[model samples]
Target: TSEECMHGSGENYDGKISKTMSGLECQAWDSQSPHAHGYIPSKFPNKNLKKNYCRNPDRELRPWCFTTDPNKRWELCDIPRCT
Candidate 1:
């Protein structure tokens, strides 16, 4: 369901593209620009949602989504424990 999580409505692709991060050092962050190609809905203003789909190798090595009312850059989501 990575595609759904990435592009589905109300998911990561809501009003803006969400940030995707990985806990594993080798995995790079995926950031999408609003003006970039394949930008959808054409005119939705960027919410600057400060959300991240992070992957933790300590867990099942799966991807989890997290967000905050106040931005904490580079911070991982706590809901999905990495134990």
Candidate 2:
């Protein structure tokens, strides 16, 4: 899926942006590089966070991801709503 493409609140967004709005690289869902996150696929079996793509696994306002930067745990994916 396109990085800017998403439906509704992007709850089901499996797109690949892998970067933050501020241009921060996103950490792998399985990696605790910057830190450890609980939004793993094992934890949320329904959501498919393919690769390091942006995801809305927990019904957030929009798709987002944990960042690789230790200073920033996460940031908005800045995806656009579907037409």
User: Over the stretch 1-83, how does candidate 2's per-residue lDDT look in tens digits?
Assistant: 74357665677677756777775778878845766677776665665676678787666786788887778887777766667
Clashing pairs in 2: none
Which lDDT value does model 1 have at 35? 18
The regions of model 1 sitting more than 4 angstroms off are: 1-28, 33-51, 57-71, 81-83
Which predicted model would earn the best lDDT?
A: 2
lDDT of each: 0.30, 0.71
TM-score to true structure, per model: 0.20, 0.74
